[PDB]
Amino acid sequence: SPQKPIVRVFLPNKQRTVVPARCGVTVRDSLKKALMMRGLIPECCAVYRIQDGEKKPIGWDTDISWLTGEELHVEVLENV
Q: Is 34 exposed, middle or buried (0-12, 13-18, 19+ CB in 10 A)?
A: buried
Method used experimentally? NMR
Nearest to 47 by CA among 65, 68, 64: 64
Q: Is 77 exposed, middle or buried (0-12, 13-18, 19+ CB in 10 A)?
A: exposed
Half-sphere exposure in the Cβ direction for 60 (13 Å, CA)? 15
User: How many residues does the structure list for the chain?
Assistant: 80
Q: Strands, E, within 21-78: which ranges? A: 45-50, 55-58, 71-76
Domains of the chain are: 6-76 (3.10.20.90)
